[PDB]
């Protein structure tokens, strides 16, 4: 039937005030997520505020917007606004909410906002108990950083105590990058990182199964042989314990490589986010760059 | 790169010259060996050490989550993963410290990363005598 | 004693509905009380 719109009109079903469109207005060129295409919609299906719930996971609000659609902001017109969704390896031009400082550059990332300093700043559209929360654009390092460390809090829970969780979750919270201190809110275990931990599992057991004594002993040869401030601080950071090598065969070891592959493919999907743009510029206030669009 | 440590014997040497030389379609080429001067440059070193990380630490770690999670998985896929860990044992801490090797696991993989995938840039479709340039379409 | 040897080491949890597939769930009293029934019925089976 009806083709994809790609110019979206939104309407506020709201009396908005001078202040209100104000702050509207600073937002042109700004990312937000939308989950319904259609040429008119209604302010109520704009931003993040319809997923926050008394669920109230950080897992969940990301799997929930992984699966939204991304477009950009256009001029703002009273009680009017006009958003465009991007073509994948056109040039944009966007704007950064967050902050978060970008670079010339790097990848970006689309992740729930976290909370920042005296978390000090909410004075965003407000109308009628509905908000607009945006998404936070981060580059690539804290968004994995991020994602692993929500990982490690759910592997770490299995089989600690209530309160052991409690301060190791307290420690994995508080990200430090590009410095500025970040921290992400609401670390919840539901059956949303339950799977993401089903998988790891899974992936470690068959990287530990699928590694050959080649690929094991390696760690235990350099050591013997090398010394360095990376070896020591790894090997202090792994258990403790010429010759010929036994077994030598050029093409097992590939075949065995290149199923491990796969398998390290697995485990790195669970902290790798989508790009969504491609930084090459950055106004030197750090407020907006010029993007390539991924999607 | 892996095999870099053992090349005092001919067994490996010859295992080397094998992985060395690589066919094509209708083309043999031999690539340069990772080690010069008898000593393996420090991004291969690198790329190997974090190879091997994060299989022993996978080989360690694993087996104590899977225990737990396996109990509860429905999918009686996570009993058969620890099985097959039981199987590799049987072949053969501080809470802190536990962050710390988690930690380490994962950004032993962040370092493989660069080498464990890799982009398309174009795919092809042109013939002729002039092999020398084809057209393509450009990704990115 | 361990009278059946099984080749897998660990046990599993089996789900869905006993049409689906074969399953040999008894407890001792059913099946003491199967075997008496048994017993009776031998003595009531020149």
Not at chain 1, 252 to 270: G, K, T
């Amino acid at each position: 039937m009806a083709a994809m719109e790609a110019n979206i009109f939104c309407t506020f079903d709201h009396k908005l005030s001078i202040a209100d469109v104000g702050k509207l207005t600073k937002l042109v060129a700004a990312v937000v997520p939308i989950p319904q295409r259609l040429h008119l919609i209604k302010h109520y299906q704009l931003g993040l505020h319809q997923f926050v719930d008394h669920t109230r996971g950080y897992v969940r609000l990301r799997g929930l917007l992984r699966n939204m659609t991304l477009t950009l902001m256009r001029r703002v017109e009273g009680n009017q606004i006009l958003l465009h969704v991007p073509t994948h390896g056109l040039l944009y031009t966007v704007l950064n909410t967050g902050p978060v400082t970008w670079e010339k550059g790097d990848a970006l990332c689309v992740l729930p906002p976290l909370f920042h300093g005296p978390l000090a700043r909410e004075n965003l559209l407000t109308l009628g108990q509905w908000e607009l929360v945006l998404p936070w654009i981060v580059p690539m390092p804290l968004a994995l950083e991020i994602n692993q460390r929500l990982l490690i809090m759910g592997l770490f829970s299995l089989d600690r105590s209530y309160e052991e969780v409690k301060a190791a979750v307290q420690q994995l919270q508080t990200i430090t990058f590009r410095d500025a201190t970040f921290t992400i809110p609401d670390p919840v275990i539901d059956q949303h990182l339950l799977i993401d931990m089903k998988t790891a599992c899974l992936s470690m057991s068959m990287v530990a199964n699928l590694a050959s004594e080649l690929t094991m002993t390696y760690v235990r040869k350099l050591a013997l042989e090398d010394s360095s401030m990376l070896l020591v601080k790894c090997q202090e950071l792994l258990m403790r314990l010429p010759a010929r090598p036994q077994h030598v065969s050029p093409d097992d070891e590939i075949a065995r490589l290149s199923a491990l592959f796969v398998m390290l493919r697995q485990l790195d999907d669970l902290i790798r986010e989508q790009v969504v743009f491609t930084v090459c510029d950055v106004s030197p206030d750090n407020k907006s760059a010029t993007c390539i669009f991924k999607g | 790169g892996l095999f870099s440590l053992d090349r005092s014997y001919e067994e490996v040497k010859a295992a080397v010259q094998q992985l060395q030389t690589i066919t094509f379609r209708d083309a043999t080429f031999t690539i340069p060996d990772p080690v010069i001067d008898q000593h393996l440059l420090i991004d291969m070193k690198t790329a190997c050490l974090s190879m091997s990380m994060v299989a022993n630490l996978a080989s360690e770690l694993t087996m104590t989550y899977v225990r737990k999670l396996a109990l509860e998985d429905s999918s009686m896929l996570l009993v058969k993963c620890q099985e097959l860990l039981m199987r590799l044992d049987r072949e053969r801490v501080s809470p802190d410290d536990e962050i710390a090797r988690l930690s380490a696991l994962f950004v032993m993989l962040r370092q493989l990363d660069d080498l464990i995938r890799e982009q398309v840039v174009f795919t092809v479709c042109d013939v002729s005598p002039d092999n020398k340039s084809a057209t393509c379409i450009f990704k990115g | 004693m361990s009278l059946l040897h099984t080749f897998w080491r660990l046990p599993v949890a089996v789900f869905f509905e006993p049409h689906e597939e074969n399953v040999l769930r008894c407890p001792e009293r059913v099946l003491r009380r199967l075997l008496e029934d048994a017993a009776v019925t031998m003595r009531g089976g020149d």
